[PDB]
Amino acid sequence: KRIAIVGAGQSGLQLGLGLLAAGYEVTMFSNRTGEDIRRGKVMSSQCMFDTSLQIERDLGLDHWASDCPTVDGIGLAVPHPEQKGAKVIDWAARLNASAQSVDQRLKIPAWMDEFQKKGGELVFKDAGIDELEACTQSHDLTLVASGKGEISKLFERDAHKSPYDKPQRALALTYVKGMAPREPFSAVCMNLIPGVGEYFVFPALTTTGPCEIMVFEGVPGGPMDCWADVKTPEEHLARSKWILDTFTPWEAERCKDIELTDDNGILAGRFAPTVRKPVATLPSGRKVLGLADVVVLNDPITGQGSNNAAKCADTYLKSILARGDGAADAAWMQQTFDRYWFGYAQWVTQWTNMLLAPPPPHVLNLLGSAGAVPPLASAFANGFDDPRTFFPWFADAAESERYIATCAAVA
Amino acid sequence: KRIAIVGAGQSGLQLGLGLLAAGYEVTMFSNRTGEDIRRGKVMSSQCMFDTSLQIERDLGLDHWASDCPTVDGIGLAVPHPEQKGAKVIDWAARLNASAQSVDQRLKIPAWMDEFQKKGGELVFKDAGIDELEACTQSHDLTLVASGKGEISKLFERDAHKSPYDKPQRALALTYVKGMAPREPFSAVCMNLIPGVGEYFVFPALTTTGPCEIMVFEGVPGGPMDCWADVKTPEEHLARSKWILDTFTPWEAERCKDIELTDDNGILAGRFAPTVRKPVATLPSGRKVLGLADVVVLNDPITGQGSNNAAKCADTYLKSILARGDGAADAAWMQQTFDRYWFGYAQWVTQWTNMLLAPPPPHVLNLLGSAGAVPPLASAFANGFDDPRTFFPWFADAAESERYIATCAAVA
Numbered sequence A, B: 001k002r003i004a005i006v007g008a009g010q011s012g013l014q015l016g017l018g019l020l021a022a023g024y025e026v027t028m029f030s031n032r033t034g035e036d037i038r039r040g041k042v043m044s045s046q047c048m049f050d051t052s053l054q055i056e057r058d059l060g061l062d063h064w065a066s067d068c069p070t071v072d073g074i075g076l077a078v079p080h081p082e083q084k085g086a087k088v089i090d091w092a093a094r095l096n097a098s099a100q101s102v103d104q105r106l107k108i109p110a111w112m113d114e115f116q117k118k119g120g121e122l123v124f125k126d127a128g129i130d131e132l133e134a135c136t137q138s139h140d141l142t143l144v145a146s147g148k149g150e151i152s153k154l155f156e157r158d159a160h161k162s163p164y165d166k167p168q169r170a171l172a173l174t175y176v177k178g179m180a181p182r183e184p185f186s187a188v189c190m191n192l193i194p195g196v197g198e199y200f201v202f203p204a205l206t207t208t209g210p211c212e213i214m215v216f217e218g219v220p221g222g223p224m225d226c227w228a229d230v231k232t233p234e235e236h237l238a239r240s241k242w243i244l245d246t247f248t249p250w251e252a253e254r255c256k257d258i259e260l261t262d263d264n265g266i267l268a269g270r271f272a273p274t275v276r277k278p279v280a281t282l283p284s285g286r287k288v289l290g291l292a293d294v295v296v297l298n299d300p301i302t303g304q305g306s307n308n309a310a311k312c313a314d315t316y317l318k319s320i321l322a323r324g325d326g327a328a329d330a331a332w333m334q335q336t337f338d339r340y341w342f343g344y345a346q347w348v349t350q351w352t353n354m355l356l357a358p359p360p361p362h363v364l365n366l367l368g369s370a371g372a373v374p375p376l377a378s379a380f381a382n383g384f385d386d387p388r389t390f391f392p393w394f395a396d397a398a399e400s401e402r403y404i405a406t407c408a409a410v411a
């Protein structure tokens, strides 16, 4: 009945609040104050689809639902190789239920406040092995929910579940005000630049109100691997507009008057997709369980990290509650992760790792057919809510043709 | 806001009650009265695992939860080829949360009563095309939830999702009183007779109170394809005991004083696993959507039909509620099924169709290893709650060896 969590992030706080509500005692380690998180740099574009949002609703944690703009569809565009400034693919499809992007700068600090108000023990320290050794002696279970923090490397990389050992994209974020709203409905507007990268943009809620978030992913060494020489916010905004002018002029028409939401509404970085073994053993022989990005870390190209974090914390909470007074031993830890991985995250991860690679012919045919077969576009869009629904037709050519036929027959 | 359902069974009634609670008008066609169902022959062994049970809880429909015996684990035994009357494999593992088997003779008629009390329109008739033509003119959506009824063949068989066109097992059920309870916990006791068939037994609740349900599955033409000459209840009970004496004498020790719960607590039959296309078009050109066993029908060897029905009706209810005033057209119908199939039922179906075939070597090694690696036994047992968690390690030899290693490392 006493649980410790290292890392006051999305999964750690969602889990901790769920545990307090179920009557557990929870100790949490945070390496930052709430206000420094609110005013520091953005961490994500955190587009959460309806199933993830519902996990939050069900815990009573959808505190921004009324004020956050809804994201109501997915759009996909590809530049026309010949015609200047035109697209050869340009379609959209509605989500069956809205997505929402609530800035983690808002959400994480407010959930830290709620955690304390609900009786959690917040401890402020950059935690290391010594804190984990202490926690495992005074608590029935200790989780590491540290995201991309260095302590996450305590867990052993799972080579067989990690096909990549290098970053597959160069990343940047720019949060802006003044973008022309998308009509007639909002969407994740996905621009796929063949051989170069991707630009995604959608509305969100941040610390100065509603905005849109521009998301840039560049094939390393290509024209959109282009943030190294950017050293000021102003240079960042300018490089952002430069990308749209150069590769997606249709989107640049929406951005004639964009400004940064704030000077810290920017980010640039990269990382390798990595899966890790969930059970780490400390020097003392005691054991800790990794959560969410500590054990399954994906490139953001499919917008699944925050969705994975919510779904992972839900699965771990259910497993803790079902265990009761049972021992939180390594077997239980491993089985808890196994259910998440084999039941769900392996399919999110396989799909995302496929999309980082160059698209094979059957995939380009799927993307093209979706522009003329609205049921297939709808399947694409709503697959973002449960990427299991892409298999096997997205990854295999013969099955892709069968599914196109199924969709065509009901259009 | 007006919905018609043909077939007053598990999925149709669960869906109908969910719809009434959400404010819809629901018309339902039943081909039997509630009392004739309560007193007629058994229809299933309906072992529902925790996720399915929770769908019922969440709708307020767990009316027997306190009185039904819990099923708390899974056991697996294989006879020893040499040693007489002994087993070469004999292990068990606890379920993380209980399963329960509430006889459909109890559940379906009580839910019919509740359906009427909550304002549903129950119509008593053996429905055919004429009723479907009428319903599609007076309702916004018409579903066919007819199980193995003849009208289910209105929907087109999906050859590519149906590897079998003949029954793979000869089936029988015997509901009994007086069986020695399993100690120290209850379980689905699975007896795998190599090359012959399977005997499963577990506690349940029926119309005369708590019982156990014996489940017999025989490879066609083999020693357990043995119900053709049985023509009375007494002969049925006797043939049931004969099987245990001949192939599972360890189970016969529990059955020295068993009696039928009632003369209609017996069943024998067979059918081919079949998947169908979800959208059927009537002579008028109007369309209907199939539900649960109408579109995905599996052999009962994995105990998944009632679980699939609950999960299918949950997915369809969520899809209806999300649609709102949107058209219930063929595309929406097809996408609703697609989410069920690609997201979930394809994996239940692939797993079950593999187990009907002879077990390959890596599978026999998995079953053997589970007796000495408790984390692998636990994975087997709790996989019954979400068969997605068997992939890819159950179906591929190299991945099975990797998972055995993972389980061994935390034992």
Ligand SMILES: Cc1cc2nc3c(=O)[nH]c(=O)nc-3n(C[C@H](O)[C@H](O)[C@H](O)COP(=O)(O)OP(=O)(O)OC[C@H]3O[C@@H](n4cnc5c(N)ncnc54)[C@H](O)[C@@H]3O)c2cc1C
Binding pocket: A006, A007, A008, A009, A010, A011, A012, A029, A030, A031, A032, A043, A044, A045, A046, A047, A048, A125, A126, A127, A128, A145, A146, A147, A148, A149, A150, A151, A171, A172, A173, A267, A291, A292, A293, A294, A300, A303, A304, A305, A306, A307, A308, A309
């Ligand atoms: C550029 C980018 C774009 C993204 N876009 C999306 C999107 O559109 N949709 C989506 O679903 N996901 C998106 N994500 C992913 C998502 O933001 C993360 O996957 C999610 O935050 C993971 O939650 P978590 O709990 O695992 O980690 P985090 O939310 O990162 O929480 C980890 C916390 O632990 C802290 N910590 C680290 N080390 C220690 C320590 N020693 N002691 C104490 N605390 C420590 C960290 O500082 C942090 O506060 C994006 C990510 C990036 C980088």
Ligand SMILES: Cc1cc2nc3c(=O)[nH]c(=O)nc-3n(C[C@H](O)[C@H](O)[C@H](O)COP(=O)(O)OP(=O)(O)OC[C@H]3O[C@@H](n4cnc5c(N)ncnc54)[C@H](O)[C@@H]3O)c2cc1C
Binding pocket: B006, B007, B008, B009, B010, B011, B012, B029, B030, B031, B032, B043, B044, B045, B046, B047, B048, B125, B126, B127, B128, B145, B146, B147, B148, B149, B150, B151, B171, B172, B173, B267, B291, B292, B293, B294, B300, B303, B304, B305, B306, B307, B308, B309
């Ligand atoms: C031997 C056996 C053992 C089983 N064991 C298990 C187990 O342990 N666990 C498990 O999870 N599942 C088990 N099942 C499967 C499970 O019982 C079914 O999959 C489940 O009942 C399917 O629900 P449904 O709504 O699709 O169909 P049903 O529950 O069968 O409902 C269909 C209804 O429609 C009626 N109907 C048919 N035609 C018409 C018509 N023209 N008009 C009106 N009504 C009509 C039928 O009479 C019936 O009442 C077993 C099945 C069998 C046969």
Ligand SMILES: CSc1ccccc1
Binding pocket: A045, A047, A188, A200, A215, A300, A301, A302, A303, A384
């Ligand atoms: C930031 S990349 C992405 C893709 C899809 C949905 C949301 C975000």
Ligand SMILES: CSc1ccccc1
Binding pocket: B045, B047, B188, B200, B215, B300, B301, B302, B303, B384
């Ligand atoms: C009736 S076969 C079976 C198998 C597993 C669980 C329940 C039933």
